[PDB]
Design a protein around this ligand. Structure first.
Ligand SMILES: CCCC[C@H](NC(=O)[C@H](C)NC(=O)[C@H](CCC(=O)O)NC(=O)[C@H](Cc1ccccc1)NC[C@H](CC(C)C)NC(=O)[C@@H](NC(=O)[C@@H](N)CCCNC(N)=[NH2+])C(C)C)C(N)=O
Lengths: 99, 99
């Protein structure tokens, strides 16, 4: 794909068993996913942004298969307004930004 | 340039005759610059992000150059952790997400 930026870069990813719509965020270091009880162990972590920080649990080694490109990595789970796909996973499906 | 995401996509921008780093952000609808003196007439605004809302002075149709390309549009100025180039400008310098 060659996605254009006219609209927001939304896609459908696949976490655990559920399919969801996340935002390809080039300005997100980590991936933060809306609350969902992924089994596994976890740890407490704070993430910030425009406006402040929110608390989230870290999940490591999660498989997410963003539109047929499966990546596997660390996903943060918490009360985020948008499922966010960040660079720790965009780099894995070989996403580049070209102008 | 074809920018890869193993590192944060920082790029140099000349805004108001000043050079400054800015992150290229596909998850931002607009462009927010840290506090600065831009000529023109500002109209207060509120934008929110992964933290919450912030107050930002709004400048309309500002000429800015991102890595030599030029853009002229809206630039919000306020208490942002890092400057950011969002979609309203990314599309002016023909930027796309590729993978
Ligand atoms: C077109 C106008 C219509 C509406 C318009 N838009 C908005 O209100 C929208 C929703 N806000 C946004 O678009 C804002 C950018 C601000 C803006 O747009 O002005 N985008 C955002 O805030 C997006 C996430 C998001 C996406 C969509 C919706 C909501 C949130 N995050 C951008 C942000 C940039 C980065 C440099 C800090 N990244 C993050 O928040 C990520 N966090 C990180 O990268 C952390 N490691 C940073 C720690 C904090 N400290 C620090 N950075 N110094 C997080 C996703 C893990 C408006 N006028 O306000």
């Amino acid at each position: 794909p060659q996605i254009t930026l006219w609209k927001r870069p939304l896609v459908t990813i696949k976490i655990g068993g559920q399919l969801k719509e996340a935002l390809l965020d080039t300005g997100a270091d980590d991936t933060v996913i809306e609350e969902m009880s992924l089994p596994g162990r976890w740890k407490p972590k704070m993430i910030g942004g425009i406006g402040g920080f929110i608390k989230v649990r870290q999940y490591d080694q999660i498989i997410i298969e963003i539109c047929g490109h499966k990546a596997i990595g660390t996903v943060l789970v918490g009360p985020t307004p948008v499922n966010i796909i960040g660079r720790n996973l965009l780099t894995q499906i070989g996403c580049t930004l070209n102008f």
